[PDB]
Design a binder for these strands. Sequence first.
RNA 1: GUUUGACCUCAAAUCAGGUAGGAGUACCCGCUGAACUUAAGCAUAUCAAUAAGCGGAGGAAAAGAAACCAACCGGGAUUGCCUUAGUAACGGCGAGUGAAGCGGCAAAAGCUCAAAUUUGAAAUCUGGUACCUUCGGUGCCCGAGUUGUAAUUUGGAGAGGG
RNA 2: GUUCUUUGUAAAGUGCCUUCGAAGAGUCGAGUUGUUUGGGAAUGCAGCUCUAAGUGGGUGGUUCCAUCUAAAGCUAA
Lengths: 130, 72, 50, 184, 186
Amino acid sequence: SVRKRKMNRSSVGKATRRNKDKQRKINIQSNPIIAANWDYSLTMAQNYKKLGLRAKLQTPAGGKETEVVKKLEELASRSQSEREEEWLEKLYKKHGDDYKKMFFDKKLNIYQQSEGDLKRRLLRWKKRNG
Amino acid sequence: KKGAASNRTKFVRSLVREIAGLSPYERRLIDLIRNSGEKRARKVAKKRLGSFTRAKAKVEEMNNIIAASRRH
Amino acid sequence: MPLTAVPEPKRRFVPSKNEAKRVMKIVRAIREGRIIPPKKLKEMKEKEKI
Amino acid sequence: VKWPEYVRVQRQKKILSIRLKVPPTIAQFQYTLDRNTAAETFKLFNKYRPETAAEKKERLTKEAAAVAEGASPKPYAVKYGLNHVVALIENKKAKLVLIANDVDPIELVVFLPALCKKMGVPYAIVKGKARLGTLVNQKTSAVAALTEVRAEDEAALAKLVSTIDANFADKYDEVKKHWGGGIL
Amino acid sequence: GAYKYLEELQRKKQSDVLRFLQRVRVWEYRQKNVIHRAARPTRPDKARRLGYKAKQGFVIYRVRVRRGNGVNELKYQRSLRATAEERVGRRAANLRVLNSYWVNQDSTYKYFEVILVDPQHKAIRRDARYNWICDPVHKHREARGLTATGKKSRGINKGHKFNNTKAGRRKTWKRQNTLSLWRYRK
RNA sequence: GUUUGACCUCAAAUCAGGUAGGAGUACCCGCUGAACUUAAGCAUAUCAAUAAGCGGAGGAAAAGAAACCAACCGGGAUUGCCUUAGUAACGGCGAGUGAAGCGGCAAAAGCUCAAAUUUGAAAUCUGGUACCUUCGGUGCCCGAGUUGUAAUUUGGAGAGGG
RNA sequence: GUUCUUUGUAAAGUGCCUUCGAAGAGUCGAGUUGUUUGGGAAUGCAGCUCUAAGUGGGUGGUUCCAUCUAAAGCUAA
């Protein structure tokens, strides 16, 4: 070649990268339970059937509870603002439970909200209080 | 739901139709309906436009220009 | 009649929530202290530029 | 004398604006609202300046400085976008729609006077997009509308409608006819 | 809205209003340069549905091209619209040609209004709807026919009818004209 | 008012800040385009939608989420490989040219604008500028912008209320 | 993993009821000369003439039926 001829002749030095052994054996990353139980001497599909998990949901072309219990173990195992709370304080102290009157009030229910919104928000207020 | 009616676009097309006036051939076409009739009107429209189905919709469109302008 | 029968939204009658968003953003900025309130801004010029 | 290129172009465009016969949906402009009625339209419209960016910023910091430490009606302003004005006509919420006579592409606002006559919206083609711009915190506005109003200004607005109907729409019933620009 | 009134207005081109508009503007565009910049779109409706947002970084250039091509029918099989798009691509080399539309036509010249985005503008580099144009795979889309009209002239679509040019006619020619030989001969 | 002021368009500036050219070019996207040759001598045709020429990109490019294929008991973006298959079709029906759907497989991923008012509020953005925890953030100011920047909406609907 | 922040009557999703509800034009198309394709069905494209419609329009299949949504844009392997 033209450029390669000079680069193999120059005293600059080649940017040699030996990244061939890293192409075959890539470490499993996304799950530490799988990361501890993965036999690197076995292949991908062999390490799936060893653990139990299905590797391909479509039936493959060609010819083909030890750990899943640990997964099952770790898988079987919204507050209100100061102003919103004080707003619901005002509504309860002036009305109580008359949601028709409570939502037809122009002074406290400035946002013309329904009855269902009011009873839900007040019960959130009542659960967090006495 | 091929060409869903759309009350607004029918209004808009007809709103622009009355404002913009008529193209010089359509201006001849509406004179040609009153004098010579739909026979020669469709003949000129077919030569002017692409196909016969074009000339159907166009002469009828112009007949509705006349039907609204004269009566109502 | 108007051309379309579009139902009018709640927000056209209720006090605006974009306004409420901006107000409750400046509120945070005052708690944090990065916006000095309009009342104290007079006091910053009553003491300075004399 | 010898003028520049652009000066010659705008002078040529000025004389071209006169000397051509023009379609009646244009020249429905320039048959516009006279000096007294224009001044009286703005004597109302100036009372509803949309709250300028500085005024809005200072007030909403006043809300924060007060309400965070220790009821209002919906305020009325003029409505000013073409998407929004042609939205408001056909709602039908517009009581007075003001239309500029000088628009950069003329084709923009050609449907608007006749759509206003269709909907029954009392429109007035007023002179100057700059003059509309002034009442609305913008350089230019093309359109300005007055949906709702304070009751103090309500009777004045209703009379502004009736004055514009009589002054504009009745004097210019001939303007839907007659191709403009036959000046010799 | 307002643009539906505009859209259906510009569908009537020989109608007396738009006839007059086009009469004035064709002459006015002759008096200017060949490629010059437009202050704003003449057809803002069609600009916007071709993706013009009226914000900082968005440019409208107006362009003029000669019409036509058996010496006088020695063909030149590329469009007038692609020629126009390329010329504005060279005068405004910092921009990226987004789309273009027809504005006015004549015996000698067809006019267009190209729409251009500034990929170096920070109002384009943020906002995740338009920052795709900053990716260097869009350096001169108009020179490789990646615009609307270029994809038309290339004949890129779907179906039976575009089999000779669906992945590009050069690609499909090179693929189907290849003696593919395997290790164990088929 | 014979004055003053809005705009519109067009300029300039060693203005502030940016950006384009040239190289390489195997592959990739375009434009432009022959001939020797082969056909019986030969305007079609063939070599060939090739070589040469010109432009334009990247690690891939292009293509791509149907104005697709089909005719089924229907499939479902593109691209690629086996198959279709030297089949259908083209061609002095001559030399010769010559696919695609289906089936298998590789790989797979979906989405976004414009068009219906935020109108109880241009909610949007760039720059300058002073700080800070600096691929940025915050404050203030000049602007862009209603001839439309934001949020919502894209047919698989979708939106306003309850 | 540990830890600091979260807020505002803030942003969503599910199912039902109730009220509405637009879809890319010198573009499709037609003619036409030229190029091009396996594309005889006139396969694509380019130039020029003329130039549409919205219970639209395109593409196929023996009285009709099926299947797409053009003329705007992005996207790995």
